[PDB]
Design a protein around this ligand. Sequence first.
Ligand SMILES: Nc1ncnc2c1c(C#CCCCNC(=O)CCCCCCCCCO)cn2[C@H]1C[C@H](O)[C@@H](COP(=O)(O)OP(=O)(O)OP(=O)(O)O)O1
Ligand SMILES: [Mg+2]
Ligand SMILES: [Mg+2]
Ligand SMILES: [Mg+2]
Ligand SMILES: [Mg+2]
Ligand SMILES: [Mg+2]
Length: 539
Amino acid sequence: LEEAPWPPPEGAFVGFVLSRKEPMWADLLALAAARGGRVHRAPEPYKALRDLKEARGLLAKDLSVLALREGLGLPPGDDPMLLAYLLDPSNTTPEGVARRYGGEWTEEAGERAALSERLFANLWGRLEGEERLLWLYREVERPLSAVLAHMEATGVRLDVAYLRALSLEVAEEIARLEAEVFRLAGHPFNLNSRDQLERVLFDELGLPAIGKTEKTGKRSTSAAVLEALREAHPIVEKILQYRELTKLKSTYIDPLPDLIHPRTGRLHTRFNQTATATGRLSSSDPNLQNIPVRTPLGQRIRRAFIAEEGWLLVALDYSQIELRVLAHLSGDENLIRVFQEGRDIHTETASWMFGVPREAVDPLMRRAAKTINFGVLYGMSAHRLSQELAIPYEEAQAFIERYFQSFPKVRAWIEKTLEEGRRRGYVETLFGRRRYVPDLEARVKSVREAAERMAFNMPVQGTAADLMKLAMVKLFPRLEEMGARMLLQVHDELVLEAPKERAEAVARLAKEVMEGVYPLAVPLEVEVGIGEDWLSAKE
DNA sequence: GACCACGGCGCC
DNA sequence: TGGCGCCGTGGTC
Ligand SMILES: Nc1ncnc2c1c(C#CCCCNC(=O)CCCCCCCCCO)cn2[C@H]1C[C@H](O)[C@@H](COP(=O)(O)OP(=O)(O)OP(=O)(O)O)O1
Ligand SMILES: [Mg+2]
Ligand SMILES: [Mg+2]
Ligand SMILES: [Mg+2]
Ligand SMILES: [Mg+2]
Ligand SMILES: [Mg+2]
């Protein structure tokens, strides 16, 4: 390319180098742009950032996040990563995408800008004729990148002192559990090592090994294994209690307070737009899509996520989203009627499991019912179902045959999806987002059947993801008009932050937007809550 | 310090 | 059952 002085003309493709992967923590080492056979290298990256009208190119969102961090309203535009990801969700990295579509992902800004230009040209050519994928790009992925950029740059408030105090409390309880475990074992060892624990439980002690690890074929010390050994030895209960506490402390309680940004005073995650095979987003550095909520201690951690002073959090969650999506995709008359009548499968399944009335079903019980409903739907064996519910094989078998007898179009839709997946080499969501599943015709039954479960799950999980993405795109400008913020997304959940005076209005509006984003054969219902913290904003 | 693989497990 | 990312361990570089 012909070397030309900064700045570049409008609509140029940008290239940039960061000191680290996280845009909120990165130092902009270099900045460059490419257009019309020319390449423009910035003398000073930060200053040159102001000359750009938009971030157009590879990893456009990340540069936009860094710009927002610096108080610059620099929206992300075209990004070859998004084009490639729509063609094939296995296109997750700039290294892979570059190699596959015409170039190399180097560590020089000028070359990255030149790469972005060429990749866009080729990938745009690949999307020609693909109207449905083009629609997803223009209407979903590209505008969503802007929304995500704001979310990442905004961050969430965290009660640091609360967590640091909690750490000291948990540490003492952990000490009590490990002391008991070492006594029961008759000797101390590394309780954090599953290899050492395996020897203690199965060799040294008398406990029998139930299962094996997937990859190394060693005797498993997993939860499911320990759950069945709870009455065989008192050490098992202690190990399980130790597991939970150390898990939460090492993953959440301890590292999270150390990640508060010195300028924003808030916690900043990354929403990865090209990281899953189904079309879902992912969250990392840190992951804020797996903050605990099940156990009492997990709930205490959840409460540490709070609203800014003078603000309130608004939490919105789609009701039974993937079941409703299933009703639309399969076109099952009965399943459609279930939601038209306003029934709840999760509640009904829970009442059956625990043998209680519908009014007796609590959130924890309803949570367990989700494992059953989605598990059975996505091909859980009758053997495991019997084990999960501690029931005979016939009863578990009776539940699955009953599960599909009510909705005949479901099994039919699954089989249709599978055949089409084998023939075309891919399956697709309602909007046409595709996933290539080549192991549908594998020799090995375990490999082939696993691929099948991946295959017919994607149109359901992916469509729900498409719906949520579309809702976020529509909702965001409405929130900016009201002075509200979009903070987090948890697959079918949205967490907003609104000024107290407008909190109620924002909640109503956001509920309406999500419910009416893209109507199906069944209505979409959204549960909404408001509160000072994430947990309270749900209850 | 870094990467990887692995078991394990947090959430949807 | 599916979809993720992060923990410590173990091994390595
Ligand atoms: N085990 C699985 N296997 C396969 N797929 C799974 C799952 C799975 C799960 C799980 C266990 C934990 C789920 N979450 C809870 O039970 C805690 C929810 C508390 C907050 C409730 C918010 C609404 C409040 C209403 O008052 C979710 N999914 C998929 C399928 C779901 O449709 C989608 C979103 O899950 P959720 O929102 O948790 O459950 P649903 O939306 O189906 O029901 P909802 O509870 O009415 O929202 O994610
Ligand atoms: Mg830091
Ligand atoms: Mg939901
Ligand atoms: Mg949810
Ligand atoms: Mg309505
Ligand atoms: Mg793994």
